Amino acid sequence: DKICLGHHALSNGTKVNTLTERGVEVVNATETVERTNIPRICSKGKRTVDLGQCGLLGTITGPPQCDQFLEFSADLIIERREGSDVCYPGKFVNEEALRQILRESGGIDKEAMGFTYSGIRTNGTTSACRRSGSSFYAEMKWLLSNTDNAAFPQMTKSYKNTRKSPALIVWGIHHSVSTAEQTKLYGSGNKLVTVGSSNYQQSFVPSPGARPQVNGLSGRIDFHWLMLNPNDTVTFSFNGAFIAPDRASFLRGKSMGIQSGVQVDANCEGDCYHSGGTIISNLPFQNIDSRAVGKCPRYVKQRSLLLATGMKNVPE
Amino acid sequence: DKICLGHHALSNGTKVNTLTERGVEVVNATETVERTNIPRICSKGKRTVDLGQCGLLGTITGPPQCDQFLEFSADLIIERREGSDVCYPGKFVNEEALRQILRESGGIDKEAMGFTYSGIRTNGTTSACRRSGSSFYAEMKWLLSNTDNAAFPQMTKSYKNTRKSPALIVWGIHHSVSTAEQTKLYGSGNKLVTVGSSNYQQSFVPSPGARPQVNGLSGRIDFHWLMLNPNDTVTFSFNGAFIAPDRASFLRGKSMGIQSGVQVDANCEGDCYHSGGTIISNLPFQNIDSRAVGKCPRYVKQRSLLLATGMKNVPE
Amino acid sequence: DKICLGHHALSNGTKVNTLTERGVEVVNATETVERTNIPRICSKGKRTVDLGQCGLLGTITGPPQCDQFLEFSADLIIERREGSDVCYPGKFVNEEALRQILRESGGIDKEAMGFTYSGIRTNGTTSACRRSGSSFYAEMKWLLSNTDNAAFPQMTKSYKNTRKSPALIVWGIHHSVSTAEQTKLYGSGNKLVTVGSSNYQQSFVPSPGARPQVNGLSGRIDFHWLMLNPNDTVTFSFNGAFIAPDRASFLRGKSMGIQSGVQVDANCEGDCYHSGGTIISNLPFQNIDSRAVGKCPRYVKQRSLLLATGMKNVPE
Amino acid sequence: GLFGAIAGFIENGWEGLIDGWYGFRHQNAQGEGTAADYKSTQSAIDQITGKLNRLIEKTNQQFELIDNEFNEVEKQIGNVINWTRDSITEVWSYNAELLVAMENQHTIDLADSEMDKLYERVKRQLRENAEEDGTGCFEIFHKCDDDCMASIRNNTYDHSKYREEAMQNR
Amino acid sequence: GLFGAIAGFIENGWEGLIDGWYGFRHQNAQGEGTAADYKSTQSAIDQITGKLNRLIEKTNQQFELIDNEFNEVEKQIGNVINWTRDSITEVWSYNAELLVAMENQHTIDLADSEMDKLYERVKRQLRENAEEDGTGCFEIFHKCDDDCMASIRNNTYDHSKYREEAMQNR
Amino acid sequence: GLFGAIAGFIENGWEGLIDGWYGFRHQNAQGEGTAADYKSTQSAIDQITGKLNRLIEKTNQQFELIDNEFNEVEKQIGNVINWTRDSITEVWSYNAELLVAMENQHTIDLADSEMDKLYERVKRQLRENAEEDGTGCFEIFHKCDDDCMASIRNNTYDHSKYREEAMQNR
Ligand SMILES: CC(=O)N[C@@H]1[C@@H](O)[C@H](O[C@@H]2O[C@H](CO)[C@H](O)[C@H](O[C@]3(C(=O)O)C[C@H](O)[C@@H](NC(C)=O)[C@H]([C@H](O)[C@H](O)CO)O3)[C@H]2O)[C@@H](CO)O[C@H]1O
Ligand SMILES: CC(=O)N[C@@H]1[C@@H](O)[C@H](O[C@@H]2O[C@H](CO)[C@H](O)[C@H](O[C@]3(C(=O)O)C[C@H](O)[C@@H](NC(C)=O)[C@H]([C@H](O)[C@H](O)CO)O3)[C@H]2O)[C@@H](CO)O[C@H]1O
Ligand SMILES: CC(=O)N[C@@H]1[C@@H](O)[C@H](O[C@@H]2O[C@H](CO)[C@H](O)[C@H](O[C@]3(C(=O)O)C[C@H](O)[C@@H](NC(C)=O)[C@H]([C@H](O)[C@H](O)CO)O3)[C@H]2O)[C@@H](CO)O[C@H]1O
């Protein structure tokens, strides 16, 4: 007598939201917000450099913890909490700009400045910088006066960038513990260091005085930098208190830089990283970490957003 | 013979826009963009501090207008146009960063530095800073030489933050009217002040010279600051021209900071504020002020966007 | 016997994307992403100033290449790659902020400072700044000592802004080639320049030393600036090494500023510009240049997004 | 709308119908009468109020000041901030315009749809006892008094009861 | 589309129909003929052109330069700017993709819908004088000449005129 | 949904139907039987999986760090960055919520639509040999055995074969 039409159903369905309604039950649904973290840096197939105790900015100056990173090469650069940029207490002027440059550099290649010195000492070391006895930043030279209290002769040194890419140049200003200890090292009088590239003009007068003991030492070194263009020249006029660059750094290509406290893992591949590991997902959204970097799903505040993949569930 | 089906209608409807059409008339519609402002700061149920003549940065240093705000506590902090951060002419280095810190501090709690002085004067005042006769910033000490033209002995003072949260430290550099008046106050020679915390290195040499008369005075005071971490120490090496912190500030918790020229009102509650008062609305959008702060509807350029809540109106 | 209903179709249709499907063919479709560039700056009906060899910041100081731009007026300002802000080697402190101000100024109007000098020279020139023989920045005055090695008397000069709008003030600090050549020009001793407006406090000590030869010259001039409010006064206390403003600049109204390397064209009108020319389109999106300025379609990464304007194409 | 009922084969609405959104206007030996269909009205109202509750919502995201109306911030950082805020304004202004247009299109199609669902329900009730006029009316071929009309409105109408007489009047 | 007419129970379109979007192709004693329905065509065209005007619009929001192509800005502020611009690009690229897909789905359903509305209009005109084939055709049971076909197309067709003869030919 | 079939004139679904999304449940002299319609099921599945592929997609836009978790950046620039990121979060959180709601509404209407298309296909096959119950069932007026039911499901059913006998049983 009759033929009936109908559709499939479950007794119990999956709740979703629509334009009109909260929590309507459908036959099937799928998650659109990723919550699964891999607690590891997934670096399969990527030239990876884990800096460990070496600070990223330390790769340009060369404290002992960074001796194996002076000319590194990488697609992925991992900074660690224990990493330190310095041996002898100090810090970088404009530090985070330089980090951002180095994170995406693809690593660094180093080259001799060609500076030659006459009338001054050039081998100043310290107990903070340890390589079987006292040492100093590998890429730098602590310039001094020939003898104690002696005059530091006003000096001019120049470096032309003869290569096709920008040269990262770094120099340091030493701030000694006393007004006396500045005079001991570089002689009396107020000392002046100046720097000039086509698109750069700045000057540096020191400031002796007592800072608290870091690494057992109350002295500080300021570090500065500029990017010297192809064919441009940079001149260092200095009367003392100067940490001279021995080498110049050039950037190799491209890379991605991350900060993390989890282990490296060459068994999983991923392009979305945060400090707690890797987000591996094809979902368009993620609720794991808003500061995730690389190629990531978009961060959203919602924990979950289910997308209906079936009809409305209408049980008997 | 017959039964008819139909729907309700008005002679005149409400115009709305669709994907296909501008100004289609529907039976009913509702507004989605808020335009109603309450011309008052609606602070019902909120610990509120209206700074009036006190500038927010003045709560850390303590000019007379800020004497009742030295240890305030708040969920909501209201800056006023008439507010001034200073008594003796001067300004803060990195002022807006510090304001942003103080706006969300939840107020401040003050504690003694413990600095003790020998060989110098410590009670320097002025006519600009008035508390029944001459005075000075309550939280600061104007350090001087014992007598006119006398040498200011190179000095070292240290403060460790022994507490669980960052300590806001503030000090000032005085720039006197003449090269003479600098020598009168702190003796001859070029004076140097230095500062050093784990993540901080900076130096300060003064600059005497004539500035225009503000508050009847041509002198200026620079104010500086850093956030000293738990267990870290900060050292002040100074040879003169120094305004010394007597107390250290600690942040209480959380707050919201606003700028406004309208009255406070404890009869209405609201979480969305701008300088002309409060936006109270559950609508998702607002066209009142793009710089509204707190928890606000999204600012949009459109004055009005009506959302249909009825069928298309089809009159007879 | 029968009457049939149907719809139109082509044998071959236009592929589009939907929520459900990639590349469904429809009867007709239209492009929503603009790709057509006009390789010209379309300036029909707009007061336009093409700076050519004149740098934008040079309009305030007045090197020879900017002599015809000292009081310009414009809706549209075009910077060129060959443009230079300087004649005598130097650069501006906070340069890009000042550019952004000048780009939307609507041009500038100049007015005499009223500075009068006694006890010093005031006509210092150079070979870099050429106007039939040696010259100097038109709006500036190179202040000197009356004779070689002579003392530069500590000096105070003041300017009140008596007008209804902010006054852009500019001054320069000269950094001579030697420590000797500083003493030759302005006498011995360390020189200090200070500046003070209601919302401004800064100081300037020079730094002699050898910089590389630019324009055949190893000397530099630093340029500085502040915006002086209506009725506020600015005071210049200086002991030497000073390039004094002769005139003050005021902003005329409104403008739009662009950078470009293509020709101006008064035959086409447009409001969306980039360095390769003009985007003329009513489409909501563009894939030409993400840094396009003016009133532009939104930049998107997609090359093309076709919008269906016909039914689904179903051929026989 | 998409379902061709409202402003479609029903030529216009009834301004007399204040009782609900949709309804019946019968005609017979006992005269004309009008009444609202609760079920259809309620299905449209509920769907529409559910839209409203979705959009009337509390953004619990707090934002703070990053610039200053009394003491202008440094010009460079000030222009980055303004550019960013203007960019965000552009995004929300777009979102709000599209949201409301998209929602309004759907509301109109949805109301049109409920009218169609009601119309088709009645067609099925009056299986072979009625024929379709075309203006949104059903010409009933058997005698249907006020009592009989209420049976249709309340879903109790029995087609097999009046079949033969309506069938013959074809 | 959602209404099952275009690429549904109508098997395909007519490449011969250059006169409008929709139309009639009759068959009778006097032979075959084809003609466009203006009303349906116009309702689809107007709705679609109204979409276009909505999207072809003038963003009167001006944006200025915040960085420099000739003199690179300070690297830190430069990276904040680039990050912000890239974030905004991501938002608009998404918006444009969704807008066009959402609009295209609706356009296709809307054209499908108008075809259905026209189909159902004709069913109602030919109340009991015709039956439904299933391929988008109406088999007419009385004799309907070219004159009679034009009456259907122009909405003047009288069902009660030809009823009994078509009714008997059942 | 908008088409009034699922959770409409079909009162509920069949938990017994594990073979496909839609189907037929016949009743006759030889007894009850149930079978899935492939075509309708496949049209819904394909449309839905095409939605999925659209949303499961690779954002090939790389973003870098602009702040520092180990060495806090300068507070002012830090607050601009946080404000900007929070603003962007607000935008995507909104986009994701609207996207999923809009998509879910459409999925439900689309499944409802396919059910309706199938229902109407069968109505047209059984031209005058059946009448419309109202609950989603067709009362067939001629004798239709299991063989005959398969003819309807497989689209081979000939209405003119059984016409007169069903016509007379009216
Ligand atoms: C810790 C304590 O009880 N008292 C400190 C005392 O240690 C400190 O003297 C410094 O002590 C450190 C190690 O604790 C070094 O021995 C310093 O000597 C060196 C150094 O190793 O850094 C020797 C080095 O050859 C010198 N090199 C050069 C190029 O000059 C350096 C250098 O002069 C300084 O680092 C410059 O600041 O010093 C030694 O200075 C004293 C210092 O005031 O303070 C006690 O409280
Ligand atoms: C206004 C006028 O006609 N002529 C000014 C003249 O006033 C000005 O001298 C200053 O005048 C102000 C009030 O107008 C004060 O009297 C200043 O004296 C004090 C002060 O109150 O600030 C006294 C105070 O005890 C001093 N304290 C210390 C710790 O030194 C201070 C202090 O020296 C200065 O503030 C440092 O800059 O001064 C008084 O200086 C003169 C000054 O050149 O200029 C006329 O044009
Ligand atoms: C290039 C070379 O072979 N040797 C340089 C030598 O040229 C250079 O001297 C400078 O040379 C330039 C042109 O090459 C000018 O002649 C400089 O003279 C002037 C100037 O024109 O700038 C003259 C001018 O009247 C002076 N004006 C004032 C107000 O003082 C200026 C001014 O003193 C300086 O610009 C300040 O820095 O100089 C001339 O100095 C020498 C300089 O050390 O170096 C050789 O290597």
Ligand SMILES: *[C@@H]1O[C@H](CO)[C@@H](O[C@@H]2O[C@H](CO)[C@@H](O)[C@H](O)[C@H]2NC(C)=O)[C@H](O)[C@H]1NC(C)=O
């Ligand atoms: C950023 O935008 C603000 C407005 O949102 C600008 O400040 C306004 O400036 C105009 C004209 O200069 C004044 O009429 C208003 O009083 C100002 N409004 C506010 C709220 O401050 C500000 O100038 C812009 N920033 C920069 C650097 O140009």
Ligand SMILES: *[C@@H]1O[C@H](CO)[C@@H](O[C@@H]2O[C@H](CO)[C@@H](O)[C@H](O)[C@H]2NC(C)=O)[C@H](O)[C@H]1NC(C)=O
């Ligand atoms: C921000 O992005 C711009 C591009 O939008 C970068 O500038 C480009 O840099 C590449 C390679 O270094 C050059 O090939 C182009 O000539 C540049 N284009 C433009 C328009 O300037 C810029 O380097 C980025 N900023 C930072 C700080 O990295």
Ligand SMILES: *[C@@H]1O[C@H](CO)[C@@H](O[C@@H]2O[C@H](CO)[C@@H](O)[C@H](O)[C@H]2NC(C)=O)[C@H](O)[C@H]1NC(C)=O
């Ligand atoms: C910007 O936001 C970050 C978080 O995204 C803030 O850093 C956090 O600060 C809280 C409380 O101070 C700590 O519990 C977390 O450890 C921090 N998280 C990270 C990832 O750093 C940061 O303080 C904000 N910036 C400013 C200037 O306030």
Ligand SMILES: *[C@@H]1O[C@H](CO)[C@@H](O)[C@H](O)[C@H]1NC(C)=O
């Ligand atoms: C239905 O109810 C039971 C309750 O235990 C639950 O386990 C099951 O997962 C539910 N079904 C679905 C599809 O969510």
Ligand SMILES: *[C@@H]1O[C@H](CO)[C@@H](O)[C@H](O)[C@H]1NC(C)=O
């Ligand atoms: C339901 O959807 C999920 C996605 O989470 C999918 O893995 C699965 O294939 C679907 N289930 C069935 C029974 O089709």
Ligand SMILES: *[C@@H]1O[C@H](CO)[C@@H](O)[C@H](O)[C@H]1NC(C)=O
């Ligand atoms: C450093 O170099 C100088 C040579 O100028 C030498 O006299 C001095 O002894 C050296 N010091 C050490 C530790 O080698």
Ligand SMILES: *[C@@H]1O[C@H](CO)[C@@H](O)[C@H](O)[C@H]1NC(C)=O
């Ligand atoms: C730098 O100069 C060399 C010639 O010495 C030339 O080959 C090269 O192209 C120049 N580079 C630039 C950027 O001008």
Ligand SMILES: *[C@@H]1O[C@H](CO)[C@@H](O)[C@H](O)[C@H]1NC(C)=O
């Ligand atoms: C219709 O017209 C009158 C004109 O005065 C107006 O007052 C009334 O508000 C209108 N109705 C609606 C619903 O807008």
Ligand SMILES: *[C@@H]1O[C@H](CO)[C@@H](O)[C@H](O)[C@H]1NC(C)=O
């Ligand atoms: C029409 O909508 C408004 C929202 O503005 C609402 O307040 C009111 O209840 C509605 N009017 C009627 C008559 O239902």
Ligand SMILES: *[C@@H]1O[C@H](CO)[C@@H](O)[C@H](O)[C@H]1NC(C)=O
């Ligand atoms: C300030 O303190 C010193 C003590 O060192 C004292 O000699 C001087 O008189 C004091 N001045 C005032 C106004 O109390």
Ligand SMILES: *[C@@H]1O[C@H](CO)[C@@H](O)[C@H](O)[C@H]1NC(C)=O
């Ligand atoms: C600071 O040192 C004290 C011990 O003196 C310790 O209790 C506390 O945990 C330390 N805080 C940090 C942050 O290391």
Ligand SMILES: *[C@@H]1O[C@H](CO)[C@@H](O)[C@H](O)[C@H]1NC(C)=O
């Ligand atoms: C269909 O095919 C031909 C192949 O040459 C092509 O030229 C034509 O443009 C196509 N039609 C459409 C509407 O794209």
Ligand SMILES: *[C@@H]1O[C@H](CO)[C@@H](O)[C@H](O)[C@H]1NC(C)=O
């Ligand atoms: C098809 O759309 C295009 C838009 O690109 C338009 O110019 C044209 O008028 C349309 N073509 C026809 C034949 O209607």
Ligand SMILES: *[C@@H]1O[C@H](CO)[C@@H](O)[C@H](O)[C@H]1NC(C)=O
């Ligand atoms: C510059 O001015 C002074 C007047 O003080 C004069 O002695 C000197 O000769 C002038 N130089 C030139 C080139 O005119």
Ligand SMILES: *[C@@H]1O[C@H](CO)[C@@H](O)[C@H](O)[C@H]1NC(C)=O
């Ligand atoms: C500046 O002062 C003059 C009176 O000298 C006055 O007319 C003007 O309004 C003042 N401007 C401001 C901004 O106070």
